[PDB]
Design a protein around this ligand. Structure first.
Ligand SMILES: *CC(=O)Nc1cc2c(cc1Cl)OCO2
Lengths: 235, 179
């Protein structure tokens, strides 16, 4: 995670992130809609950060510090490179839409008027197919990844050393190996919750209400296919 | 310190997300209540024992029967939530949530939690329920359900006023510690 984005999403809401003189020039319904859009981006930023801890800290650390079979590392972190590319691209698009909406002379005051188009692109066509296949694979290998982790922690003294050492920082308190895997599986089921609450405050422009309704239907369709494609593998 | 895992289950809009947020922040969010909960690791000292309590929510998973069980591995305590303003959410406890929680988490203690206890004296809630030939969940109905499902105990809280929230999570820690 880069300092610039961490600071932009440091506040608890959009109403606290923007200057108070800017907030006061907006209608309450705009403040409410922007509060949920900001939470969608802030949680996408945290999600991409969870995936970076898995690839760079845990996965790469095991390859460069331990003598484990690379097949063992693949069992511990399935599809993490693929998941990292999908969500890093999606976050990139959300952050550019926020930057485009910035008030000139400000790096914090913005109001995003269009979001539905961006959500339709992400959850439709080849983009949705790649997410469905990747999440169906990740979630089918989720239990085996936890069992492999627990076996390595209970049998290998060097693996225990590595884990105790990299997870020592306070910033990693809720981001251990098993916490990262559950955080990733649970991410997809947050999108309908975030998009339905955004939609509830997007009745001003009618094209936006429809684009958000289409995006909502597309996410639920993706979750349904991911859920149908799951078949838990064993160690 | 010892690490224990908590998962909260219950129907959508039974207040489970609100309950986790209010405990993990220590107050009712004054400016904005988040839509979602990611995870949280609370440092709890109960009866002289220091515990790391990892908090997890199942909101968003209620319609996905193959995804939802991925939340259950290694759970030490389950908060089985229902809303006191929704008598129907209490009816779904013994025939939907309990068979699933006992199948995936056998021997894991369950606390039956009645959320939104402040709505018991809310005139608008009583009026809305009276139209559907109903009334808010009486305390003895919650105790009778907890008894019927073999729960570890019955507790009531209000995430809006913060009453009973700390006691629920301290009790869940004690229940997770028992082996
Ligand atoms: C366009 C814009 O957002 N200008 C701006 C800049 C600052 C503050 C308020 C506004 Cl409206 O407060 C400090 O900087």
């Amino acid at each position: 995670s880069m300092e610039m984005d961490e600071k932009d999403f440091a506040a608890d809401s959009w109403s606290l992130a923007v200057d108070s003189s800017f907030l006061q020039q907006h209608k309450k319904e705009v403040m409410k809609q922007q509060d949920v859009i900001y939470e969608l981006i802030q949680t996408e930023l945290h999600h991409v950060r969870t995936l970076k801890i898995m690839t760079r800290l845990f996965r790469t650390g095991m390859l460069e510090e331990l003598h484990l079979e690379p097949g063992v590392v693949q069992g511990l972190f399935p599809c993490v490179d693929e998941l990292s590319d999908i969500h890093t691209r999606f976050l990139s698009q959300l952050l550019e839409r926020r930057r485009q909406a910035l008030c000139p002379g400000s790096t914090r005051n913005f109001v995003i008027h269009r979001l539905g188009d961006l959500l339709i692109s992400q959850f439709s066509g080849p983009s949705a197919e790649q997410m469905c296949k990747t999440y169906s694979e990740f979630c089918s290998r989720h239990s085996k990844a936890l069992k492999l982790y627990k076996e390595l922690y209970a049998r290998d003294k060097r693996f225990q050393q590595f884990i105790r050492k990299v997870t020592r920082p306070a910033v990693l308190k809720r981001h251990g190996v098993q916490e990262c895997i559950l955080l990733v599986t649970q991410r997809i089921t947050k999108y309908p919750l975030l998009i339905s609450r955004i939609l509830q405050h997007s009745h001003g422009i009618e094209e936006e209400r429809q684009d958000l309704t289409t995006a909502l239907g597309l996410v639920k369709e993706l979750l349904s296919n991911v859920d149908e494609g799951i078949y838990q593998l064993e160690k | 310190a010892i690490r224990k895992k908590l998962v909260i289950v219950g129907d959508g809009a039974c207040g489970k997300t609100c309950l986790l947020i209010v405990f993990s922040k220590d107050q009712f969010p004054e400016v904005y209540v988040p839509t979602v909960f990611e995870n949280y690791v609370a440092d709890i000292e109960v009866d002289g024992k220091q515990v790391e309590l990892a908090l997890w929510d199942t909101a968003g998973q209620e319609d996905y029967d193959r995804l939802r069980p991925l939340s259950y591995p290694d759970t030490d305590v389950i908060l089985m939530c229902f809303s006191i303003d929704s008598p129907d959410s209490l009816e779904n406890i013994p025939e939907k949530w309990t068979p699933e929680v006992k199948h995936f988490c056998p021997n894991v203690p369950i606390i039956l939690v009645g959320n939104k206890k402040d709505l018991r004296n809310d005139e608008h809630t009583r009026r809305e329920l009276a139209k559907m030939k109903q009334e808010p969940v009486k305390p003895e109905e919650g105790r009778d359900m907890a008894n019927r499902i073999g729960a570890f105990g019955y507790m009531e809280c209000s995430a809006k006023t913060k009453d009973g929230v700390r006691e629920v999570f301290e009790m869940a820690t004690r229940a997770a510690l028992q082996a």
